[PDB]
Amino acid sequence: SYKKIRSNVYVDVKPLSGYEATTCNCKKPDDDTRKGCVDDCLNRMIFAECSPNTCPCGEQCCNQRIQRHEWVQCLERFRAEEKGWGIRTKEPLKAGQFIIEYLGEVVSEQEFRNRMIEQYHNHSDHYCLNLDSGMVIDSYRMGNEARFINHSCDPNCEMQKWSVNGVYRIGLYALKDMPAGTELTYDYNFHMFNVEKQQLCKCGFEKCRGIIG
């Protein structure tokens, strides 16, 4: 239970990326149906999204996925085995594919530490990612479906920090091909803000670490 938000809620923090000037030099394809900025793209290489009114490809550019909230419509919440409630795809997914933005409240470290002590006592789950410079996307109360995605020691998805119009935002990308019905997973230890509490890992993998965080 949470409020669904279409976009992040900025509380007491602004996660400015520091860089702004972005022009591709990767060129428009003549076909309307063929995508513009692919793996060559200068901006994509530094994990920055193109700006629509400056990009050499304009509307052909597929390096604006967060900006344009170009999420996938497969995602389905389901009764996960031992893990509670998880999320899978009804449709096959290819590697490198943008899946969903991770949404929530953007809060400072002290604001989150406050919320942890003041409000998130005797809580069995942990809904938040490190963003930047000790800023946190908290999704305990507000967020999207990306909050139901479980941990794996062997993940098929990955949280990527992007500069979008001067602002850092986190997007979920596939690491491998995934067929219909398969649950989405990522490695928490990377992104999850270090909390004193530890949890047994039920990801069910040969070389499972046995612990989360």
Ligand X SMILES: C[S@@+](CC[C@H](N)C(=O)[O-])C[C@H]1O[C@@H](n2cnc3c(N)ncnc32)[C@H](O)[C@@H]1O
Among ligand X, Zn ion, none, partner that 26 touches (CB below 5 to 8 angstroms by kind): Zn ion
The candidate with the shortest Cα–Cα distance to 11, out of 102, 108, 103, 101, is 108
Which one, 148 or 168, has the nearer CB to ligand X?
148
Among Zn ion, ligand X, none, partner that 124 touches (CB below 5 to 8 angstroms by kind): ligand X
How many chain residues bind ligand X (CB under 6 A)?
17
Residues 153-172 close enough to bind ligand X by CB under 6 A: none
Which residue's Cβ has the minimum distance to Zn ion? 24
**Burial 187-209, CB ≥16 within 10 A → b, else e:** bbeebbbeeeeeeebbbeeeeee
Token pair recorded at residue 130:
């490190």
Q: Least distance to ligand X from the beta carbon of 92, Å?
A: 23
What whole-number distance in Å separates Cα of residue 22 and Cα of residue 67?
15
Q: Least distance to ligand X from the beta carbon of 76, Å?
A: 14
Q: Of 8, 15, 48, 50, which lies in the binding site for Zn ion, with binding defined by CB under 5 A?
A: 50
Q: Least distance to ligand X from the beta carbon of 188, Å?
A: 7
Residue with tokens 């700006």: 51
What whole-number distance in Å separates Cα of residue 144 and Cα of residue 101?
8
Amino acid at residue number 66: I
Among Zn ion, ligand X, none, partner that 199 touches (CB below 5 to 8 angstroms by kind): ligand X
Which one, 128 or 201, has the nearer CB to Zn ion?
201
44 binds ligand X (CB under 6 A): no
What whole-number distance in Å separates Cα of residue 80 and Cα of residue 101?
22
Which one, 98 or 120, has the nearer CB to Zn ion?
98
Q: Rounded to 5 degrees, what angle do the CA atoms 128, 143, 88 make?
A: 85
The answer to whether residues 185 and 157 touch, using CB atoms and an 8 Å cutoff, is yes
DSSP 141: S
The answer to whether residues 70 and 85 touch, using CB atoms and an 8 Å cutoff, is no
Q: Of 150, 156, 157, 186, which lies in the binding site for ligand X, with binding defined by CB under 6 A?
A: 150
> By rule CB under 5 A, what string of x and - marks binding of each residue 54-93 to Zn ion?
-x-x---x-x------------------------------
Task: Tell me which residues touch Zn ion (CB under 5 A).
Answer: 24, 26, 37, 41, 50, 55, 57, 61, 63, 153, 201, 203, 208
